[PDB]
Design a protein around this ligand. Structure first.
Ligand SMILES: O=c1[nH]c(=O)c2ncn([C@@H]3O[C@H](CO)[C@@H](O)[C@H]3O)c2[nH]1
Ligand SMILES: O=c1[nH]c(=O)c2ncn([C@@H]3O[C@H](CO)[C@@H](O)[C@H]3O)c2[nH]1
Ligand SMILES: [Zn+2]
Ligand SMILES: [Zn+2]
Lengths: 157, 157
């Protein structure tokens, strides 16, 4: 099931960059194999620098489920969540995170050198016991290729 | 001017608690002593765990100026911004953060031990360049008092 939802996040990244909503980032929030939210980066469409794919997905899932905690849900991110998005995942009480590409793949096409210490376990104050899986193999290769594939179809931000 | 805007952020915190919008947190974004945004936590109002005072203020400031970067603006937070909000502050390119109370003040009254390494200077992957001022004296007293005064006047989240 991990491959299915990570693939959906990747295709959301492509869709969002193709419609000009924002950058090539997708996020899918699922509740026991039922997709609650399927979103991409909306920074350009919303004129909102916080409207990352993950934050957008959290907003939508919480509004749809009428609760501010997503402890029964998991989030699939096309790319490794940034510090803001990882903090949002923590505040959401999401119980699992699966992400496709490492943040370096986005940094390679010019994005901010902006990586969540708590995700990589390199913090003094911020810790995390969130279950975190970095995908490998097939879906991971596809997810990493997103940034080379889309790098001239959108504005950096 | 720092004290005036920090006190307005604290006033926003009290205001938001009174109307049941969310927790005792406020944020004011200014552009050369002109207020661009004045908000409080809206997590309960919006059913959105990302709607912290800082994130709400960034969204509204960027909507008012019709741009996704706030490089000429400064932000005043009644309480030390969390990892999510400090990440959003990074992404917004706000050039200066002035915050009132230490995160320990919010932790003492029930909020998560959820502290941003990059704000306190212990981040490894996240490196902030923005100027950061922790308020002293009367401003610190105001901001810390927020959490004693609003104890059990709001629903925790
Ligand atoms: O988690 C993220 N979600 C996004 O939508 C997004 N859009 C851009 N970025 C930037 O990509 C880099 C790798 O996380 C960081 O510079 C992010 O700010 C994003 N990070
Ligand atoms: O930066 C923040 N803005 C808020 O609105 C807010 N509301 C609650 N909290 C929590 O307070 C603690 C200290 O920052 C952390 O547990 C935050 O999640 C907040 N942090
Ligand atoms: Zn992000
Ligand atoms: Zn916050």
């Amino acid at each position: 099931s991990d491959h299915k939802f990570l693939t959906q996040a990747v295709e959301e990244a492509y869709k969002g960059v193709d419609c000009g909503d924002g950058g090539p980032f997708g996020a899918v929030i699922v509740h026991n194999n039922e997709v609650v939210a399927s979103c991409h980066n909306m920074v350009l469409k919303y004129t909102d620098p916080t409207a990352h794919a993950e934050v957008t997905a959290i907003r939508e899932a919480c509004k749809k489920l009428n609760k501010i905690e997503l402890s029964e849900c998991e989030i699939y991110a096309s790319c490794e969540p940034c510090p803001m998005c990882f903090g949002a995942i923590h505040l959401s009480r999401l119980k699992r995170l699966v992400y496709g590409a490492k943040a370096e793949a986005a940094i390679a096409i010019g994005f901010d050198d902006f990586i969540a210490d708590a995700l990589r376990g390199t913090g003094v104050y911020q810790k995390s016991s969130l279950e975190i899986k970095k995908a490998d193999g097939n879906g991971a290769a596809i997810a990493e290729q997103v940034f080379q594939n889309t790098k001239e179809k959108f504005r950096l931000y």
